[PDB]
Design a protein around this nucleic acid. Structure first.
Lengths: 12, 12
RNA sequence: GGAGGAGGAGGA
RNA sequence: GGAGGAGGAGGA
């Protein structure tokens, strides 16, 4: 995991 | 250095 | 949190 | 670029 990790919600 | 590193232009 | 830089809109 | 998560607006 990184931040919001590849849990890409907005998916930046 | 990190990205734009503590070269904080805006300094997000 | 620096190991990415992918990205700066967080900063550290 | 994953080790931070600080931050997700990049994603990798």
């Amino acid at each position: 995991g990184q931040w919001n990790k590849p849990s890409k919600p907005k998916t930046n």
